[PDB]
Design a protein around this ligand. Structure first.
Ligand SMILES: C[S@@+](CC[C@H](N)C(=O)[O-])C[C@H]1O[C@@H](n2cnc3c(N)ncnc32)[C@H](O)[C@@H]1O
Ligand SMILES: O=c1c(O)cn(-c2cccc(-c3ccccc3)c2)cc1B(O)O
Ligand SMILES: [Mg+2]
Length: 218
């Protein structure tokens, strides 16, 4: 059943419930992309940057993924749809209302079984990932939360022993608005090997970009 439609997020979800095929992840993604292109802008990674996220996953084939910043569940659906049987996505969202919409988005898209949604701040949840969430290390991290948190969380992930030789970090919005402290760290450190992907801001013609940084080991 539908939500009131009071917030943009409830309206994006209602649109999906009314205008997309249940259990069809592609259909769900197209509906969110269409709604935000035509009706109301929203901070989903979008279809053009979404294709870059697709290719990174398809190249490195992660089994254990971490996403920081869920929102309405667009990238969770996008990433989870490409995962092998037994692969897990952990997605961390601070806002309980978004987390509610994300769970519903994920259920509807048929990727429920792939996703562990955790309500809370990344800095409180990250130190718990091993003991509470049964994580050894991560194959891949998607960073798409507050941009001033990209660097402290990257270091925290390192300090907590969650990064290994070959962990792929992928960061949205390194051009728009930017995360220059994170970008200097990964590019400047011999612990990371970086690739830059120029693209466009979601639903706009503004230039944006993603950075891929593969961890070398400490
Ligand atoms: C750009 S949106 C996420 C978009 C999502 N990755 C997508 O493409 O569909 C940013 C989200 O990050 C969340 N967020 C910001 N800081 C956070 C933190 N420290 N821990 C967990 N979530 C956070 C915000 O509440 C917001 O929902
Ligand atoms: O994930 C995000 C993202 O993908 C884009 N922006 C963002 C920042 C500044 C301007 C604009 C912007 C410009 C022009 C038109 C519309 C939006 C967008 C913010 C977040 B975030 O998590 O805080
Ligand atoms: Mg973004």
């Amino acid at each position: 059943n539908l939500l009131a439609g009071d917030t943009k997020e409830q309206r994006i979800l209602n649109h999906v419930l009314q205008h997309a095929e249940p259990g069809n992840a592609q259909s769900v993604l197209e509906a969110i992309d269409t709604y935000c292109e035509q009706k109301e802008w929203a901070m989903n990674v979008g279809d053009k940057k979404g294709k870059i996220v697709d290719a990174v996953i398809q190249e490195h084939q992660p089994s254990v993924l971490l996403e920081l910043g869920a929102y309405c569940g667009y990238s969770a659906v996008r990433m989870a749809r490409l995962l092998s049987p037994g692969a897990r996505l952990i997605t961390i969202e601070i806002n309980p209302d978004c987390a509610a919409i994300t769970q519903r988005m994920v259920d509807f898209a048929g990727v429920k079984d792939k996703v562990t949604l955790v309500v809370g701040a990344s800095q409180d949840i990250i130190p718990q990932l091993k003991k509470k969430y049964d994580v050894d290390t991560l194959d891949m991290v998607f960073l798409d939360h507050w941009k001033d948190r990209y660097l402290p969380d990257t270091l925290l992930l390192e300090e907590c022993g969650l990064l290994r030789k070959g962990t792929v970090l992928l960061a949205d919005n390194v051009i728009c608005p930017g995360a220059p402290d994170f970008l200097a760290h990964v590019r400047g450190s011999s612990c990371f090997e970086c690739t830059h992907y120029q693209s466009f801001l979601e639903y706009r013609e503004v230039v944006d970009g993603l950075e891929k940084a593969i961890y070398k080991g400490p």
